[PDB]
Symmetry: D2
Subunit: 157 residues, 4 copies
Amino acid sequence: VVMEEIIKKAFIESINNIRRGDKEEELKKIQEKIVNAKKIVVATNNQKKFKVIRDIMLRVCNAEIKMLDIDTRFADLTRMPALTKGLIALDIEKADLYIARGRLGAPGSGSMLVILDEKGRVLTASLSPSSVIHKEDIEERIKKELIEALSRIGISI
Amino acid sequence: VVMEEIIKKAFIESINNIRRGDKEEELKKIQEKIVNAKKIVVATNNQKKFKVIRDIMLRVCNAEIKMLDIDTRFADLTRMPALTKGLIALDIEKADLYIARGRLGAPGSGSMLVILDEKGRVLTASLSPSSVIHKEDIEERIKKELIEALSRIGISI
Amino acid sequence: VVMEEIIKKAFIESINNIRRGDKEEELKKIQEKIVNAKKIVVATNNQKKFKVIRDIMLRVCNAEIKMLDIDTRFADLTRMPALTKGLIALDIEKADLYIARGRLGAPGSGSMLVILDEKGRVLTASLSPSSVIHKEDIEERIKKELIEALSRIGISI
Amino acid sequence: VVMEEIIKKAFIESINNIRRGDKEEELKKIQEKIVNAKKIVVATNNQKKFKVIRDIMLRVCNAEIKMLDIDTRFADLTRMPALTKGLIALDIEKADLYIARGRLGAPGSGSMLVILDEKGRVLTASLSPSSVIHKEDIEERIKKELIEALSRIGISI
């Protein structure tokens, strides 16, 4: 059924104080939105990071997958750069799925990879430690982030 | 040495396109804010969950630690409930540090634990799968959330 | 062209410092979005307030106009309640246009009427003082808010 | 009497449905914060725009009034540029009051002047039509915006 209807029931449950965790139908919908996506925009300009994300997502959906034409480094001026990058992509690209990776919050907070639907809803996300504290090959780090973000909502790669 | 001056310089690196990841100085400030915290507000009404968070943070700070007087279940109507709870606590309680736990994003997106400073900046966070995807005792999960949120920015428990 | 391309151009102008205020085409896009809207959701339960908003918007578009099924008073816990109400409506109802009215910001900040498109972009808005500073019949107040929000982007009813 | 405590009472009124518009005490607090402000930061680099805002605030308060070291035009990549500018200033400058002016929402949506307190709360704001809709010397526009923003919360120039 439609996402708006699934969310409506959840909002009502919360209003009437019977909300007890996520529902099965909610997780299937998130899975369905990701899986049945036809267009994905990855909010990055770095071609390496894009390859990894693209190669991964090509295994779970049959979608046209695109990189961002403009420099999103300016999202690092906002409080949560990763969401900002995703919303930037939402504003300049028509798509079913937006995947953005950048800093979590304040300088020093490390990185977030986030996945948004066509309305900018946060479907899933994953975090990584600061590179100051724990340096790692960025190809393996993104690979692990994407894997967690997908597996935590029931999609296994 | 004040946070504002460090973030400024980080913002300048992004503006002039020389920003290449987080800095050591940035990490120390975040560590300082959390470690030297004297007043902490936990944006929850669940006394169990508060107990776990309080006990953990007392191992890293000598701080007066308080729970929220009001029901934050209404935050679950927003796009990112966990963050909303923190900003609610920020709005009605004076404190050095704010810790909030709730839904990540949309229904089904699992849970987020966040730590905010006195200006609502995002210092660090952690994520967990929905109990639908992975069941777990909520006391051990929350303990795991806080420890990761602390450890990913270099704070040992 | 599509909204996504118009915004892309504007963003490019700001990044590369050729942006000098809004463009004429950008203005037409917002107007077109309001006029050709086929489904409108008013984020309220107040049927009185709904009447005024519905009747006015029927003067500018031939659209299905709907009221919110749920209580949006809990948005008043957020930093900007009116926007929150729009985003709540956006989450649980499929529509071309979302119109929300509520508190601007902090308690005392007065009221905001905001209009959002299907992706939650802010197309236009208008404000009113707290009834503390200037009392007014709420039906004329809202009618006044809506007309200005429409007139400020060049739409006369 | 402290702002967090008045907001708590307001939040409680909204939660248990006793909230009936803004209260007198709330507006006095916003007035105090603005009038008794000791440090004000204007989120701009434009000395003309800074002059007007500074000139105006000097008639209502005796405050140190400062301009931003960095260019906040990149806030135009976010969904609500004026607010983003305010939060950029909040992140990199210690102050009692933050005044930001920029675009309201999407391209074409016109301009917003907003005033934030030291925790990033929206105290008051004003809007202007796009310069496409009504041309005006920007010095008179900003002056009219600020004056509208102050009088609507009860502060006269």
